[PDB]
Amino acid sequence: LAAAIAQAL
């Protein structure tokens, strides 16, 4: 789920 952040930015 954390990779959502990575992708967002």
φ, ψ at 4 (rounded to 5°): -55, -40
Q: Return d(Cα 4, Cα 7) in angstroms, integer.
A: 5
Experiment type: X-ray
Structure tokens at 1: 């789920």
Q: Would you state the structure tokens that stand for residue 3, as one six-digit string?
A: 């990779």
Resolution (A): 1.1
Task: Give residue for tokens 């954390």.
Answer: 2
CA distance 1 to 9: 14
Residue type, 2: A
Q: Give the single-character DSSP code of 2.
A: T
Give the rounded distance of the alpha carbon of 7 from its chain centre.
4
Q: DSSP letters of the chain?
A: -THHHHHH-
| N-term to C-term CA, the chain | 14
